[PDB]
């Protein structure tokens, strides 16, 4: 079962603040029009592949990250169990973390883990009708920078009529974000998708002639 | 604040298992560094040793091990000798401060200290910051005599030995490599 993510999955790649300029960055992004798997038993343990785009429409409680999930390796079970969210990496405790909870809507997350750091983005745009993944462009803001660095290559979702959640895999492709006046991202073109859309990355605009 | 422990610690790690005690989130005054009679080599690379109080730098790593006399000059960026080929590599862009002082009152027994080993042979040529803690056999020569361990194959770890009658070239020098990037 495949669904087509239209243009979603763009986060702020940096921590600086720009304004009204067309920035060109090179990082791990979700490709445009990439095949994303519908998961309508429900939770097979899936690989990591240096970054996955989780996106589900409170039935979802969280995710479990690790290598094989026993008492041998350290796990990472990101669970929103209490009125506030907790994060446990124990199996023997090395780290814990409590913050404001992460919890129709459209919950999106872009997980990535590179060089000892665990990064996690978020968004909470609302949607009523089920275009499965909507067409609108919205950015993602990072929640926490987690310097734990457990080698993670497997992830499995905690849970509790069938529910839906999508997972699409990241790749090293470069984008071209359009920053707005205020400082938000409102559009982005891909520099590897279409032979039209390559020319918007080597002419540094959104209009060609 | 956070690195009075990494310098004055009773024992130090050996070259294959280099410590990587990581410090963050307190002020590092550096006033007990670069003016001290105990130190012997303070050769910072890409950053001057002066003007280090007035900067603010993040994710500063503090490596540690012990090496002998004529091996301090292999912790430079580059200079492929013996312990930089297989044991400890400092990447070419470094931004750091190798601090190689002298310790012969602490790290020498009556019959020689043997707690500071190193890796003489290794099949693999290393990557920067790549620990190679595994102790598998080296197979010197194209020879399938694997399990015998007599010759044409070597157990890679080997001990230093530190007797206090030895010369300046082979006394142990407790280096400390403060590494930091932006």
């Amino acid at each position, epitope marked *: 079962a495949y669904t087509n993510s239209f243009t979603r999955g763009v986060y702020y790649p940096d921590k600086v603040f720009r304004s009204s300029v067309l920035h060109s960055t090179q990082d791990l992004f979700l490709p445009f029009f990439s095949n994303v798997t519908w998961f309508h038993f429900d939770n097979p343990v899936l690989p990591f592949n240096d970054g996955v785009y989780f996106a589900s429409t409170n039935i979802i409680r969280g995710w479990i990250f690790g290598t094989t999930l026993d008492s041998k390796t350290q796990s990472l079970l990101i669970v929103n169990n209490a009125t506030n969210v907790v994060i446990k990496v124990c199996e023997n405790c090395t780290f814990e973390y409590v913050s404001q909870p992460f919890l129709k809507n459209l919950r999106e997350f872009v997980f990535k883990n590179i060089d000892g750091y665990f990064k996690i983005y978020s968004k909470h745009t609302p949607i009523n009708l089920v275009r499965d993944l909507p067409q609108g462009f919205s950015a993602l803001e990072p929640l926490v920078d987690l310097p734990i660095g457990i080698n993670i290559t497997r992830f499995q979702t905690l849970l509790a009529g069938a529910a839906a959640y999508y997972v699409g895999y990241l790749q090293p492709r470069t984008f071209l974000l359009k920053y707005n006046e205020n400082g938000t991202i409102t559009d982005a073109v891909d520099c590897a998708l279409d032979p039209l859309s390559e020319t918007k990355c080597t002419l540094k605009s959104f209009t060609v002639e | 604040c956070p690195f009075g422990e990494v310098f004055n610690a009773t024992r130090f790690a050996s070259v294959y298992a280099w410590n990587r005690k990581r410090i963050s989130n307190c002020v590092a005054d550096y006033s007990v560094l670069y003016n001290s009679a105990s130190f012997s080599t303070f050769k910072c690379y890409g950053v001057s040793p002066t003007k280090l109080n007035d900067l603010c730098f993040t994710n500063v790593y503090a490596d540690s091990f012990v090496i002998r006399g004529d091996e301090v000059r292999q912790i430079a960026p580059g200079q492929t000798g013996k312990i930089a080929d297989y044991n400890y590599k400092l990447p070419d862009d470094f931004t750091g401060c190798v601090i190689a002082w002298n310790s012969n009152n602490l790290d020498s027994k009556v019959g020689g200290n043997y*707690n500071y*080993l190193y890796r003489l042979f290794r099949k693999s040529n290393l990557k920067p910051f790549e620990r190679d803690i595994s102790t598998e056999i080296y197979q010197a020569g194209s020879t399938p005599c694997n399990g015998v*361990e007599g010759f044409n194959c070597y157990f890679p770890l080997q001990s230093y030995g530190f007797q206090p009658t030895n010369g300046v070239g082979y006394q142990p020098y407790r280096v400390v490599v403060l590494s930091f990037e932006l």
Partner: nanobody
Amino acid sequence: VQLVESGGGSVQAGGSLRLSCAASGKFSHLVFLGWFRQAPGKEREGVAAGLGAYESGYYADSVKGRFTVSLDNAENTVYLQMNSLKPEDTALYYCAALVVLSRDNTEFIAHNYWGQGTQVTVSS
């Protein structure tokens, strides 16, 4: 963190013993280097090795096919078996333990330790 040996004494040749290196203290993996044999007035040689995560039996040629090691993760210990004792193997043996106190992935605080000494005097 200390180390404890056992299996020592004076025993006739062609008999048997069992060498055991016992650990204690606070650690996380205790990856073994192995047993080390030092002849009197000589250098110690790597008589037993290959006890890591992925490993293979490393025995020197002088005791090849005669002595065996075993990975005992109950106390994080090791057992060296003695078969067909011979006065060439007369040595003060050492066990070599790489302790590690590094619960994180990055800050690899890991000193290097050795044992005490086993009096193995055999003769025909």
